[PDB]
Structure formats: structure tokens, C-alpha cells
Design a protein around this ligand. Structure first.
Ligand SMILES: [Cu+2]
Ligand SMILES: [Cu+2]
Length: 472
């Protein structure tokens, strides 16, 4: 067999009482011969279950902390009130249980969940915490898309990790990772190195998630067969997008369709990206992350000409704007790259080049390294706003994530959004230039449980590149 079977997260629907029980517990995985790596998982030794929720239905998620240290649980992509998201203002202490009441009110999507612990988000995600949120609505159900979970509707969580000599997860929040992020030399696909999936002939639906702390990926097929993007971060697109290459940022989700009709086996590969620290082996060349082997069986699934009603971007005439300036300390930034170059070689650079030595507060937004006690502003609920997030005077990649909403990108790093990226998204690329998004917060977030907006390169977020804001 050699290629191990791609693990499928257990589907988890709400019980009769309308509740979902999540147990954040310790475990272990086997990735290197000899030693077993100590890991953390939700309802298991690594990653988590796929919570399937129906639009309109209420649910109370009961997160119990079976870990030696405190953790939190962000429902990434959920249009919910701040009083239900749980971040640094809703800490789940060891041995205790935290409840999150959610009333699903958003299109059918592949959303996800992960810890959002103050200054430890990168560490806890690297440790193996994470999981999926499958939202179903009426409009999507009518479509002839693959629906058989784990057979033709398959989740693909792509994460990179690095192990030490003692077979432990080598996580660091040091001078290097504060600048370029935590990258590894091992490529996990649902926690498995190069898995294999047996799919029926016809159409294969892959719910992709870039669960890397800092690594951006560029998905493609081994034989050059196109990938049909049908869904983005917060819902299906208006119509599918035919692509040969699909770049995916940290915390992004792309639902794609692949033609398995010919029955030929092929690989889902990741192409080397132009990002600092990410060009080292095994990522220096095209890397197969998932082997697809078509079975003799078939499905009646088809690629629809039109998916769902995609509203037009409203012309927000005199809406409030917000300038969010991401900032990095050059003195620390330079030391990080010098240390990266020394430890990993010149290849690390990927062909590239008000202060303090406060590495834990080196990265900021609008001059401030995340102050939980001071939200930047208050937004009126149900109003449109035009937010510009800038990354000038800094060459790093910043996938900007915004809590409690799904937005439409107006400008992505200068140029307009790509075909697939013009739908509903909660993450926007900010790399060396400025981006503009059209946001609207339909749910409140008080000072006590405020929303956040941060860079999804977890190490930048843990070193201060995060801001909070209220909605009322
Ligand atoms: Cu997230
Ligand atoms: Cu960043």
C-alpha cells in the first residue's frame, strides 16, 4: 500500500439536546520512525472533527479542556456575535468547560476552528489543534455536487510541521519565526505524510484548508488536469472557475471539483511559492500532498454551469472607511532574516533581500502591538464599511483575517480580486502593498467580547499584529 489512507474527520452533528461536545485532549502521532510525537487534538490525538451544522438551526458547543494549559477556540469564518467566538477574552482554563451558543446564519461553506490564545496561537495550532465546520443550506443542497462525506466530498487539511531530534514538534517563537513565521520540513495532509484517497469516477469535491502557521501553498495536479473552484472562504461562488494553479493562504478554504471520469490516478501537488523561508526542501520543487486513485464505482455528480446566487458588490457610497496599517520592526525583521540565512542557507530567502528590541511586540497595527484592553473603534451593526489594510514598507505575506463577517474584496494588493477570490472571503492577501475590502457586521461584539482582525501568519499575530474592535 505504502501511501497510508487519507484520514476522514468524523462528522459531528448536534445531539437531541442541540449540543456538540468537544474535548480538547492530549495524544500522540507517529511521523518519524523510532519516536512517537506528543500531540494535541480535539476529540482525538490530532486535528478535530467536522462539525456539520444546518443554516438557521441553533447549537451550543461544549469545549472541555483536557490539556495541562489554558486554550481558547475561534470559530473561523462564522458570522456570529462576539459573545460566542471565544478568543483571548474567553479563556478555557485546564479542566474547565466553556460553552458557545451559535445560531447559524450564513451560506453553505467549509468554515474551520482553531485556538486563538494570546501569544500562543501559533504554538497551539502547531501542537495539532484544529477542526472543520461544514455548513449546509437549502440553496446548495439542490446542486448536483458530491455529497458523500469521505467518499466524494473530502476534506483536505494541509499543514506543515517540523520535528526535533527527540521526535517532538519543534515549535519556536524566536527571532526567526517572529519575522518569517514557523515553517517546517514535513508536509501533513490531514496529519498524514502523503496520504491516498480512493474516489468514485465522475467528480471529486475537495474541501481544501491551508492549516499552516506561516506557509502559503499553490495547489495543482500532477498531470495538469484543471481544478474547478466552486467555493471560497464563506460560501460557493456564482459559477465555477477553471484553474491550473490555485494559491491558498493561511486560514483559507477553497472547495474544488476534479474530473475523475477517466479513472486515471493523479496527485494533488503544491508548487514552490515565492515566500521567505518557504523555498527549502521538500518544498523547493513540486510536492505531491495527496494521491487520488479512482475506484471502479461511479457517481451522478456534475459540475453545474451556475452554482448559487452571488450578489453584486453594493456601491457603498458614503460609508465609513478604516486604515489598518500593518507594521514590522525593521531591526528585529533584519535579525530574523540574518538568523534564517545562517541556519538554513541563502535558499531560505526565496530570491529576496519607532523601534525597540521587543520581539514579542515587534509587529503592530496602526503603531500598536495588540492591546486587548483598547479596541481601535466601534462599528454600527448592519452598516457597510470600506477597510484598507496596508503592508507597505514590509515585504512579508500577510493574509488578513477579520472576525464575525464574510466580506467582498474590492482590491487585493492593488489589482482587483481574482475570479475565485471575488466571492465571499474572510482572509485577504496583503503583501508589500495595500488591499481594500467591503465589510458589514450583522452581529454585535461588546468591549468584553470584542471582534478581532489580525494577520493569519500566526507568528505575526502572536507578536502583536492584531487589533480588536467593537460592534453595537
Ligand atoms: Cu483562523
Ligand atoms: Cu503578517
Amino acid at each position: 500500500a505504502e501511501h497510508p489512507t487519507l484520514p476522514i474527520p468524523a462528522l459531528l452533528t448536534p445531539d437531541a439536546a442541540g449540543k456538540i461536545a468537544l474535548n480538547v485532549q492530549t495524544g500522540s502521532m507517529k511521523w518519524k520512525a523510532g519516536m512517537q510525537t506528543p500531540t494535541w487534538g480535539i476529540n482525538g490525538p490530532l486535528l478535530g472533527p467536522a462539525m456539520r451544522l444546518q443554516r438557521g438551526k441553533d447549537v451550543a458547543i461544549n469545549v472541555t479542556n483536557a490539556l495541562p494549559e489554558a486554550t481558547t477556540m475561534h470559530w473561523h469564518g462564522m458570522e456570529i456575535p462576539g459573545t460566542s467566538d471565544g478568543g483571548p477574552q474567553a479563556v478555557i482554563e485546564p479542566g474547565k468547560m466553556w460553552t458557545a451558543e451559535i445560531k447559524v446564519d450564513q451560506p453553505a461553506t467549509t468554515a474551520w476552528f482553531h485556538p486563538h490564545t494570546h501569544g500562543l496561537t501559533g504554538r497551539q495550532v502547531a501542537m495539532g489543534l484544529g477542526g472543520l465546520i461544514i455548513i449546509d443550506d437549502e440553496e446548495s443542497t439542490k446542486l448536483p455536487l458530491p455529497k458523500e462525506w469521505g467518499v466524494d466530498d473530502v476534506p483536505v487539511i494541509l499543514q506543515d510541521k517540523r520535528l526535533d531530534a527527540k521526535g517532538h514538534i519543534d515549535y519556536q517563537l524566536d527571532i526567526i519565526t517572529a519575522a518569517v513565521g514557523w515553517f517546517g520540513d514535513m508536509m501533513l495532509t490531514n496529519g498524514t505524510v502523503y496520504p491516498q484517497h480512493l474516489a468514485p469516477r465522475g467528480w471529486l469535491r475537495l474541501r481544501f484548508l491551508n492549516g499552516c502557521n506561516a506557509r502559503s501553498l499553490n495547489l495543482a495536479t500532477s498531470d495538469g488536469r484543471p481544478l474547478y473552484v466552486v467555493g471560497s472562504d464563506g460560501g460557493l461562488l456564482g459559477e465555477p472557475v477553471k484553474l491550473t494553479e490555485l494559491p491558498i493562504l493561511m486560514g483559507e478554504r477553497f472547495e474544488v471539483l476534479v474530473d475523475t471520469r477517466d479513472g486515471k490516478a493523479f496527485d494533488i501537488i503544491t508548487l514552490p511559492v515565492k515566500q521567505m523561508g518557504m523555498t527549502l526542501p521538500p518544498f523547493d520543487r513540486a510536492l505531491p500532498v495527496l494521491h487520488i486513485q479512482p475506484t471502479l464505482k461511479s457517481n451522478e455528480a456534475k459540475l453545474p454551469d451556475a452554482l448559487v446566487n452571488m450578489p453584486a458588490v453594493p456601491a457603498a457610497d458614503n460609508v465609513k472607511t478604516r486604515w489598518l496599517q500593518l507594521m514590522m520592526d525593521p531591526q528585529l525583521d533584519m535579525m530574523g532574516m540574518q538568523m534564517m540565512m545562517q541556519r538554513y542557507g541563502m535558499a531560505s530567502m526565496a530570491g529576496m533581500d519607532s523601534a525597540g528590541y521587543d520581539f514579542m511586540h515587534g509587529n503592530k497595527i496602526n503603531g500598536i502591538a495588540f492591546d486587548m484592553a483598547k479596541p481601535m473603534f466601534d462599528v454600527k451593526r448592519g452598516t457597510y464599511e470600506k477597510w484598507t489594510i496596508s503592508g507597505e514598507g514590509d515585504m512579508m505575506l500577510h493574509p488578513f483575517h477579520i472576525h464575525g463577517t464574510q466580506f467582498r474584496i474590492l482590491s487585493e494588493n492593488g489589482k482587483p480580486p481574482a475570479a475565485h477570490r471575488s466571492g465571499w472571503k474572510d482572509t485577504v492577501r496583503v503583501e508589500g502593498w495595500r488591499s481594500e475590502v467591503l465589510v458589514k457586521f450583522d452581529h454585535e461584539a461588546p468591549k468584553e467580547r470584542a471582534y478581532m482582525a489580525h494577520c493569519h501568519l500566526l507568528e505575526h499575530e502572536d507578536t502583536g499584529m492584531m487589533m480588536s474592535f467593537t460592534v453595537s
